[PDB]
Amino acid sequence: EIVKEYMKTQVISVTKDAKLNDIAKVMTEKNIGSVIVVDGNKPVGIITERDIVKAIGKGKSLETKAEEFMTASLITIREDSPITGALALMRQFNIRHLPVVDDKGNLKGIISIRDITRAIDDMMGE
Amino acid sequence: MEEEIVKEYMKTQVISVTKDAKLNDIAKVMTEKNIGSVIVVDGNKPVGIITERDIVKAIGKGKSLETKAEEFMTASLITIREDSPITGALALMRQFNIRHLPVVDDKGNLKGIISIRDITRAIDDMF
Amino acid sequence: EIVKEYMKTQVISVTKDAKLNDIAKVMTEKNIGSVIVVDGNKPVGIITERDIVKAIGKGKSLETKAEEFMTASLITIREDSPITGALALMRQFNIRHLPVVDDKGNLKGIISIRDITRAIDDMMGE
Amino acid sequence: MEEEIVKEYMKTQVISVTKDAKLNDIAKVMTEKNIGSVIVVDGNKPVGIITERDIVKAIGKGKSLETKAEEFMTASLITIREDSPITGALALMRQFNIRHLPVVDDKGNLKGIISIRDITRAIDDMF
């Protein structure tokens, strides 16, 4: 089983200077719970619904920039990689989400631990 | 065997906020308690629920940090008494196509939350 | 949801005087884990793989008759009944299996608690 | 984070019978311990497994009550060390398309049983 068959297809992202309220609006209209923060050319972080609640919960304003409340992270994975490969990286880098790119580097999707345990559920004798 | 009752399978010590609690204070509770939702109460009685998504949605709609709970929560008055048999909670969940139900006492006050998973565990238990 | 959509289709049964070793042979060839014991016209009990192991485990011989090691029970349910109806009977009569019959009384199948919890799993917003 | 290891998620205190144990004695253990299967060992080392179905099958094939464990068990030498990382057990399960694995110590002796559900729980835990 590969990342591609379990990741959530998603090419939308937001810049490191994007505003929290604007980010929230994108996620709401696109109907997504997580989003990759890119420093123009590459992913530099991830933002989930929990990160937005936590940011407000810590005293940050609705204008706070993405880079100030996202989970900073540079690691990515190829969509062709085995899911167990994604699991290993999430563990080693302590992250619940992985931006998924192609052989060229273009952002294709995002895969999370939920997807991993799911793929496991889908896969036996006693 | 006798019927198992909600009270013995519900998750107690749930977190709630009043219907006029402000968005920022609610986000603060969820952040400090590390939870993904809270029950909104009106004088101890459940009137809705606020999830992380409800918060993000309200912000994405331009609501300020002072927005009251009742203005952006998911409204719901569906509840089940703690003295109710397990299957009673099940019948209510099916009827309203929902996985969780606030649990109240005979006076209508919030006591806990029971989920569809709690129900199957109760079935497994008695068997 | 009704019993019929979750029960295991099965019209085979064994008599109350049937021998344990013969019962075991039927279940093995038909590849089933449970079986209804009938007193000719109606169900009078149930026999599962566990009952056969338990019978041997208690000192009974391979020749032991069905009625001597089965779970005695006369209750049945219609295949058209709602699953919650099956759950109620299993609870009230303390049994993990229910012989399923039709409007005429013919043995159609057997439904167990596993089927019930399964049907529940298959069925929502948060 | 470091890798979780089999030892911390395996079910210990499992029941085993020797490879020459008789069918009736094995059935007696399973009945008295109220379990659905036992590990068959050869000098503490796992050589197979006997489930309720294996017992019924042997009887249905005319085997007597004195039939030895090794004659009707499901033979299997696939095992995983208790010091192994969780994913190691996972890789072995996938490879052999099986949901459970006997766990042994460095000397090959039976210590427990780890299942695919234990693996997902370990994943949920560390996350």
Secondary structure: elements and pairs:
The structure is a homotetramer.
Chain A: E1 8-9, E2 13-15, H1 20-30, E3 34-38, E4 43-48, H2 49-57, E5 71-72, E6 77-78, H3 83-92, E7 97-101, E8 107-112, H4 113-121
Parallel strand pairs in A: 2-3, 6-7
Antiparallel strand pairs in A: 1-8, 3-4, 4-5, 7-8
PDB class: oxidoreductase
Keywords: CBS-domain, Structural Genomics, nppsfa, National Project on Protein Structural and Functional Analyses, RIKEN Structural Genomics/Proteomics Initiative, rsgi, oxidoreductase
Assembly: tetrameric
Give an account of the 3D structure.
- The structure is a homotetramer.
- The first copy, chain A, has one domain (about 1-125): CBS-domain (Roll), CATH 3.10.580.10.
- Chain A has helices at about 20-30, 50-55, 85-90, 115-120; strands at about 10, 15, 35-40, 45-50, 70, 75-80, 95-100, 105-110.
- In chain A, strand 7 and strand 8 (about 105-110) form a beta hairpin.
- With about 130 residues, chain A is of the alpha/beta class.
- Chain A has a 4-stranded mixed β-sheet. Chain A has a 4-stranded mixed β-sheet with strand order 2-3-4-5.
- Chains in contact: A-B, A-D, B-C, C-D.
- The interface of A and B includes residues 28 and 29 of A.
- Chains B, D: Pfam families: CBS.
- Chains B, D: This is CBS domain protein.
- Chains B, D: Keywords: CBS domain.
